[PDB]
């Protein structure tokens, strides 16, 4: 009837990125007056959203990244959405951010609005696939919405 | 079923060129069950053409290296264009600029631009102003009908 969707976000604690480890996304209720899980025929598992309904989806993410975590190594990261397992990354969902100097403050990342065929049991997660030094994820959010 | 299209480049970097549509050769993001994510649109290799009138959300992402340049600053302004590269869409613009050499890749995403489109409309991502060399490491164009 209504399209399937899910929204999971982290606005409660920064997290350090860890190679191929899905990002923690504990919250599903963004409305500050009337919070309610914005979840329909999906499942938020704590570090991702599981598909329950076959179809075409828009999936996307946002990250806030601080690159000031080292005194000697300029920091960088490459991020993707993964399908099923962290290694099974989705081409077209990739982003990158890299600083050649130490002490770089927050920068913003957003993926494209990725349109993709998904199937029941598909677990969509945000994964770092390459990290240069320590990367501080100040906040993150993952969006799943059925188009067809 | 809504019209939609998703075209991306995850296979080769490309230097930005003025009023030159970015190359977007791929339309199959699912790594396990690859299918063209194209319904009642056409991906022409450097953009997506509309076949059906309606309200669409159109948007793009860029991954841009600002340290693959013999001079600084490294800067670019980018828009979606309609039909022709000079015919840019107000509201679809983005911009980055590094005045020195301490920056590699940065991220850009346009807004999720809502817009009336019409059969024949060709949507492309164009640089409209550049300083230095601006390296497009990856890019993706999204079109999906609102209905």
């Amino acid at each position: 009837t209504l399209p399937a969707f899910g929204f999971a976000f982290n606005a409660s604690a920064p997290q350090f990125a860890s190679l191929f480890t899905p990002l923690l996304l504990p919250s599903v209720s963004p409305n500050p007056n009337i919070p309610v899980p914005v979840i329909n025929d999906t499942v938020s598992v704590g570090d991702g959203i599981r598909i329950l309904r076959a179809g075409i989806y828009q999936i996307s993410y946002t990250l806030t990244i601080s690159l000031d975590n080292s005194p000697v190594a300029p920091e960088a990261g490459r991020f993707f959405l993964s399908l099923g397992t962290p290694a099974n990354i989705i081409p077209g969902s990739g982003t990158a951010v890299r600083s050649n100097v130490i002490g770089t403050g927050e920068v913003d990342v957003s993926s494209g609005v990725i349109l993709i065929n998904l199937n029941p049991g598909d677990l969509i997660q945000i994964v770092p696939v390459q990290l240069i030094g320590t990367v501080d994820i100040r906040a993150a959010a993952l969006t799943v919405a059925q188009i067809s | 079923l809504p019209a939609f299209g998703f075209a991306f480049n995850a296979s080769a970097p490309q230097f930005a060129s003025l009023f030159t549509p970015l190359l977007l050769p791929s339309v199959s993001p699912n790594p396990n069950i690859p299918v063209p994510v194209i319904n009642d649109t056409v991906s022409v290799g450097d953009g997506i053409r509309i076949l059906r009138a309606g309200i669409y959300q159109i948007s793009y992402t860029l991954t841009i290296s600002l340290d693959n340049s013999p001079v600084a600053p490294e800067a670019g302004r980018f828009f979606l264009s309609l039909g022709t590269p000079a015919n840019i869409i107000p509201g679809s613009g983005t911009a980055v600029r590094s005045n020195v050499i301490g920056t590699g890749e940065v991220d850009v995403s346009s807004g999720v631009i809502l817009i009336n489109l019409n059969p024949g409309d060709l949507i492309q991502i164009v640089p409209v102003q550049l300083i230095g060399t601006v390296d497009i490491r990856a890019a993706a164009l999204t079109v999906a009908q609102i209905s």
């Binding site: 960088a76 490459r78 993707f80 290694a87 990354i89 081409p91 990739g94 982003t95 990158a96 890299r98 696939v129 390459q130 240069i132 | 480049n9 995850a10 296979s11 080769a12 970097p13 991954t63 290296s65 340290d67 693959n68 590699g104 890749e105 390296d135 490491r137 990856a138």
Partner: peptide, 13 residues
């Protein structure tokens, strides 16, 4: 495709 070869990659290290 290996993840080191899926764009975007770092233009330099």
């Amino acid at each position: 495709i290996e993840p080191e070869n899926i764009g975007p990659t770092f233009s330099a290290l």
